[PDB]
Structure 1
Amino acid sequence: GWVWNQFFVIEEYTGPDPVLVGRLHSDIDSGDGNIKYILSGEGAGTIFVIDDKSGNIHATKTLDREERAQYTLMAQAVDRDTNRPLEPPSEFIVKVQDINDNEPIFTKDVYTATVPEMADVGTFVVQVTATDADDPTYGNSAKVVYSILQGQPYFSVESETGIIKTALLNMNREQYQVVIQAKDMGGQMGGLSGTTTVNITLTD
């Protein structure tokens, strides 16, 4: 049930010379260059190039996991001269590994909501949503949390759902402007962040 037929590459290779992805290899390759490795499939001969005596596969361009996350390719091993079937062809996959190179992005840049005056504490106002394109296989690198910049103590926001509620009894002033931040990494150090504005209007 193990899985070994895959290699990994980092999103955003901002480096000088092309990078190695992995190496194909048949146990019959005795090191005398009489065996010819061949790529084929998604990206073969373009994004992914192979040296057919060694088996090394290289990434020719810089890849974005948001554009494509996974390339499925084929691996053959033929006889240098006759090009006969030496090893049956087998599939393998290269995974553009994620980096948290995208901030949370509020669907809207401005929300408009209404809530009644003199409402009890915890009255629902509106729910904001910051989407995050980072889709790591696992990890909290894309875990969005909502916090209230401007609006306290009048309003509280729910860290996980972006639901805004009233937080002061018996509310003088008619319109409040709230600012909510969506920070990834679970809000931890170095997390990226986007913001939005919520223009609430009390009602009678």
Structure 2
Amino acid sequence: DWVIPPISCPENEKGEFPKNLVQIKSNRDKETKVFYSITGQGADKPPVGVFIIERETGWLKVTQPLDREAIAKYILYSHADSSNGEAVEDPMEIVITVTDQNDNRPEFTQEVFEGSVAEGAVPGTSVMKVSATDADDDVNTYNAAIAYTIVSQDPELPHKNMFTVNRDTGVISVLTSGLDRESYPTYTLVVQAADLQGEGLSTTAKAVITVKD
């Protein structure tokens, strides 16, 4: 069977269903009457009826909103028959790809991270790792592409930015010098994770840094 170039349908559609996607038909329909149908998971097997096809015209339709994060892709088969029951084409394998949107917010693996730095440590040294996940499509979009930032430091001393976060790795490093356990022994950072490479949906967690001797 040929495999159709994929038919895209974005997730979370609203309004009137069903909606037309694409017309799939046989160029033999002037030689004999052609009746169309589709089978497979999403047509006549679970989930039944998400897609339906017009029996005489071959208009493929979707009957409800989709969620890429539940099902990313459907495989079905179209069929062309004539009155006498002969198949007028081999089946075609129909591929339908659910096209992503940014409908998922990043999430930190924990609501509080804990680390230790040694007070005499060099601007460069690695303190700790923070971690988020996005459920969206990390292959075809930036909707799951996470920029880690530091939003705030407490206390703001000796300097405001004692610390640096690598925006891709979520690794927290020492930016700056004057780090003394006995002046200021614990810092509480508010860290942000935002998708769209930093520009999109965001969430915050806390990172608690204990200064050591």
TM-score of the superposed pair, with normalisation by structure 1: 0.90
CA distance, structure 2, for counterparts of residue 52 and residue 17 of structure 1: 18
Task: Please list, as runs of the form range in 1=range in 2, the aligned pairs for 1:82-97 lying within 5 A after superposition.
Answer: 82-97=84-99
Equivalence for 1:42: 41
Q: Spell out, residue by residue over 1:152-203, the C-alpha distance to the aligned partner (whole angstroms, 9 max, x if none).
A: 4111101111111122213101111001111111123xx1111111111111
Q: 1:5 touches 1:93 (CA, 8 Å); kept in 2?
A: yes
CA distance 1:63–1:74, shift in 2 (3 Å): same
Task: Please list, as runs of the form range in 1=range in 2, the aligned pairs for 1:60-99 lying within 5 A after superposition.
Answer: 60-79=63-82, 81-99=83-101
Deviation at 1:113, TM superposition (A): 1.1
Letter in 2 for 1:70: K
Question: Does residue 185 of the first structure (1) align with residue 196 of the second (2)?
Answer: yes
Structure 2: state its 5+ residue gaps: 154-159
Equivalence for 1:125: 127
Deviation at 1:136, TM superposition (A): 5.0
Structure 1: state its 5+ residue gaps: none
Task: Please list, as runs of the form range in 1=range in 2, the aligned pairs for 1:125-204 lying within 5 A after superposition.
Answer: 125-135=127-137, 137-151=139-153, 152-171=160-179, 172-188=183-199, 191-204=200-213
Identity across matched positions, percent? 34
CA distance 1:137–1:114, shift in 2 (3 Å): closer
Deviation at 1:31, TM superposition (A): 9.8
1:56 to 53, 59, 70: 59
CA distance 1:137–1:121, shift in 2 (3 Å): closer
Equivalence for 1:15: 15
Q: Spell out, residue by residue over 1:90-131, the C-alpha distance to the aligned partner (whole angstroms, 9 max, x if none).
A: 212000000111111111111111111121112211111111
CA distance 1:136–1:30, shift in 2 (3 Å): farther
Deviation at 1:17, TM superposition (A): 3.0
Give the number of equivalent residue pairs: 199
Question: Does residue 29 of the first structure (1) align with residue 29 of the second (2)?
Answer: yes
Deviation at 1:137, TM superposition (A): 4.3
CA distance, structure 1, for counterparts of residue 5 and residue 75 of structure 2: 11
TM-score of the superposed pair, with normalisation by structure 2: 0.87
Paired residue secondary structure (2:91): strand
Paired residue secondary structure (1:169): coil
